[PDB]
């Protein structure tokens, strides 16, 4: 039996149905979803940390000249100093006073520490989500990982789900994402070989252990102080460090409907958006007929409680006769107001109380119990808190807080003036032909 | 801060994330004396609020305008055949009904 | 310097452009690609291979009863079989007539040649085209890999190159693929757990080693024959075996626009689709001035031999008179005709030799010469091969062989029309004139 729904992507709550077959017991079928991943597909293109500048020791030659010779080292600069007097510990090093000649090389590597504090260029796109379902159709419940894509079957005891495409096909992520210390940034960064000075990618190697790094740090090796041996330069600062210090703020923290990004599979979690389509093939052996389950005769509801609250603050009773003592469901058609549980217990003369939720301020609903309806009637009045620590379990119905009151002044005030104009064309239409009838006269 | 139905997420330093949803409590009463319920529609509902008074003001001024229209055009089509006869005696019934002289 | 082109999606065939900065010497560009790739992203579903029912022993109990334990193992069937009288080598088993009692146990496994036999069943979306360009840009030449999405530049020697993304989303691949042997085939394979017994996919193993199958094939125990030790079965026929007896070709023999289909990863090759947009970013230090390259004066180009065939097959001669002995770029700016070699070394005095390929009957192209322009033009001839086993080196230009003949006829069938037309209307304006002259005498 193909049955259709239809459920909103929203974690924790529970979400309930039945199925009735024209002539047989009503089948309750309940879902609750409990996480609601979003795993794009996603591609490693560099990682970056900070560099090292790397110097080799000073060639140095007593009344001679030195040359350069490249190693092709990643940015790897050389120059030749002539007219170079230096001095060691023990004295000084050459005894020519002009014609000596030293030789500065530097070069950029990556830092010891790039293992552990590295962070990770990625692109996403076309995501895949994936739901972690507790279903149950005919108090048989499975709990299975349910893929979201329009097919991928979940199959449990002959019954075949098939939960369809979100009717969105929104992400957090955006086209280019960086991952540093478990969190995630939407950050345009360069492409691999055009990696700036002094910002985010001025280091690229390709993965972590990679041994091939692009490296642009702007390096320029300076002429060394009069009578010392070491090699002076002058280069931008790590751009890692000044992608660090500035850094606005994560995804974790930024992103729309209220997602939860994580990092070991890069997903976000329980955004609240779009909903997820069903498809129910039922086979008929589920379906028990009418007369093994109980049939009430004599029904009626009466409302205790009934505050219009965000959770279930209204509490229905119905006074019933049925001659037999079993479990049947209960649903209401409407999205008037949201049941709590999916089935009552009964005895054969007891009185049932169930526990609804609503946003109306007049709910008028048609509850239905085991095969019947009853109508169930009454007043809910404003709640005492204005702010919960909890989400919202009913629907808000266009026209649903109206207050009899408020239909009574729109019924007056609009309605009436339409009787004033229809008692103002009756009144020109009889004078017209009041004229007509006088001036029949000649 | 302003927290509406669709929620609301604050992180103070080191302490978990609190999230808030707003619930519809709104200041007056729904259920008389009709400046109470238009304070209440107004925080509960405010841009469809104004809109709705704007359209049922003129739907109102539009009725009572052409009702007055059209009863003072009755009233002169009914007393204009007794005001052109130059012995002018307007009935009776009809100087009760039209306010005549 | 930004210099944007467009080169056509085609391997092997070079592709020859100069850029002509107004006051500087003209600079040669000449890219040949060699390889096209076209890579899909590539999602693992499951595996199939021929299956293998597997079978418990048969446990008898003399003058007992027997029950069903479950092992949960894949399409397990335990039928219980009561009223056996079985047997050995070594005679009778039990010593009773009746009330023996025999359980079979069938179950499917996968085979045993599932690790080098088995076909894999992907997703495919979202192609990634990458190329083996050869690129040389004014005497500096590399070979290397480029990505041909919108950015991800390659540089050499300060030039920073562009492929832009193709102007064609098109893939030869569908939705869905599978993978058999070297072997790649668009083909809608039923999703994991929604598969049918007696074909494809009856079978579903998540991995290869995953420890975890789908088996739906129709598997039913039968009653075992009178006094014999055996587990009769029944089961429909394995779907591999009849997937790879129905087999439609594979995805390297009907693929269109010439597609080489690989997998060491899946990838199409040299697909005969699409365009490459290119950009150039060149330096302002390549730009040699005028005054240090050759400049001729007194060029003039004859036409010796002009063939519109598709390969080279037009030889034409220029004699020029030139103010110094150096290499220089020719270009022709139209694809009129297309040039074999994008230089030609010069002598002071003396006369060149290029080889151009033309579809045209009656070509009048301008050469491009290193700074000047002739004015190339001739008559070509149809080749003598009707079909040759190389593609087309020129473009096919709208009215480029129309044997001018050909032209005389239609400027005759159109423009006599038009003359006999305009001296009839001509005519009657006379004709009015004149009737309104000789009425004025009235």
């Known amino acids: 039996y193909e049955h259709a729904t239809t459920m909103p992507s929203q974690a924790g709550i529970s979400y309930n149905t039945i199925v009735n077959r024209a002539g047989y017991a009503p089948l309750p079928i309940s879902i609750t979803p409990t996480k609601i991943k979003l795993i794009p597909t996603v591609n490693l293109e ?13 060639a140095i030659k007593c009344c001679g000249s030195q040359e350069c010779t490249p190693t092709y080292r990643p940015d790897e600069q050389c120059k030749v100093f002539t007219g170079v007097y230096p001095f060691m510990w023990g004295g000084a090093y050459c005894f020519c006073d002009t014609e000596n000649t030293q030789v500065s090389k530097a070069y950029v590597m990556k830092s010891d520490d790039c293992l552990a504090d590295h962070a990770e260029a990625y692109k996403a796109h076309t995501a895949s989500v994936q739901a972690f379902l507790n279903i149950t159709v005919g108090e048989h419940s499975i709990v299975t990982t349910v893929y979201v894509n329009g097919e991928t079957p979940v199959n449990f005891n002959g019954v075949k789900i098939t939960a369809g495409p979100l009717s969105t096909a929104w992400t957090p992520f955006d086209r280019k994402i960086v991952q540093y210390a ?42 060394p102080k009069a009578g010392a041996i070491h090699v002076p330069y002058t280069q931008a600062p790590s751009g890692f460090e000044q992608w660090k210090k500035d850094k606005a703020p994560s995804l974790k923290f930024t992103a729309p409907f209220g997602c939860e990004i994580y990092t070991n599979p890069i997903r976000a979690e329980n955004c609240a958006v779009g909903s997820i389509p069903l498809a129910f093939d039922i086979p008929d052996a589920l379906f028990t007929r009418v007369s093994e389950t109980p049939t009430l005769s004599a029904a009626e509801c009466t409302l205790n409680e009934c505050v219009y609250s965000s959770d279930f603050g209204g509490i229905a009773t119905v006074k019933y006769s049925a001659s037999k003592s079993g479990k049947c469901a209960v649903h209401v058609p409407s999205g008037t107001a949201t049941l709590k549980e999916a089935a009552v217990e009964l005895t054969e003369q007891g009185s049932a109380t169930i526990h609804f939720s609503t946003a109306n301020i007049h709910p008028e609903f048609r509850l239905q119990i085991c095969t019947s ?10 709640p ?18 109206v207050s009899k009151t408020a239909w009574t002044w729109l019924t007056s005030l609009l309605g009436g003036s339409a009787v004033i104009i229809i008692i103002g064309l009756v009144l020109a239409t009889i004078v017209a ?10 | 801060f302003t927290v509406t139905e669709k929620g609301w997420e604050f992180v103070w330093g080191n302490h978990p994330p609190k999230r808030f949803w707003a619930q519809e409590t709104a200041p007056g009463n729904p259920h008389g004396l009709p400046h109470e319920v238009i304070t209440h529609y107004y925080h509960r509902y405010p841009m469809s609020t104004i809109l709705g008074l704007s359209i049922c003001a003129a739907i109102a001024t539009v009725s009572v305008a052409a009702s007055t229209w059209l009863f003072c055009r009755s009233r002169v089509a009914c007393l204009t055949p007794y005001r052109l006869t130059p012995n002018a005696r307007i009935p009776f019934c009809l100087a009760v009904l039209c306010c005549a002289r």
Not at chain 1, 182 to 207: L, V
Not at chain 1, 384 to 401: C, E, G, L, M, S
């Open chain 1, 373 to 382: 309806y009853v109508t169930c009637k009454g007043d809910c009045h404003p």
């Open chain 1, 182 to 223: 478990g969190e995630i940034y939407n950050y345009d960064f360069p492409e691999y070989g055009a990696g700036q000075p002094g910002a985010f990618g001025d280091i690229q190697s390709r993965t972590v252990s990679s041994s091939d790094l692009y490296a642009n740090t702007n390096l320029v090796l300076q002429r």
């Open chain 1, 46 to 58: 560099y990682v970056t940390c900070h560099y090292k500048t790397g110097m080799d020791s000073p």
């Open chain 1, 433 to 442: 032909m009041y004229v007509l009838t006088n001036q029949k006269h000649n």
């Open chain 1, 384 to 401: 005492k808190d204005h702010i919960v620590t909890h989400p919202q379990y009913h629907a808000q119905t266009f026209t649903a807080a």
